[PDB]
Amino acid sequence: SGVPSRVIHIRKLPIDVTEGEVISLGLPFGKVTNLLMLKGKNQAFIEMNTEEAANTMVNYYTSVTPVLRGQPIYIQFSNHKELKTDSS
Numbered sequence: 001s002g003v004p005s006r007v008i009h010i011r012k013l014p015i016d017v018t019e020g021e022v023i024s025l026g027l028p029f030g031k032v033t034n035l036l037m038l039k040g041k042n043q044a045f046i047e048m049n050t051e052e053a054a055n056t057m058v059n060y061y062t063s064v065t066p067v068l069r070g071q072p073i074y075i076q077f078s079n080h081k082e083l084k085t086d087s088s
Helices: 019-029 051-061
Strands: 007-010 033-040 041-049
Touching: 007 051, 019 033, 019 041, 019 051, 041 051
Parallel strands: none
Antiparallel strands: 007 041, 033 041
């Protein structure tokens, strides 16, 4: 059944790109509730307002990968409950 997936961990992405793109892809998936580009190890994390959104994000990308102006940026699920906002 449903899979606890709210945060979408974007891989193979040069954290720093533009949101309009990252979110642009999520548009059809549903709605973006947040987009934090962790420059750390080139990894982004977006939060979908609906479960059907988060899933479709990675699920659909299960085969087809999204790129940026010619830069393929993988979109995978998260590895934690939910994205924490700094410290409130």
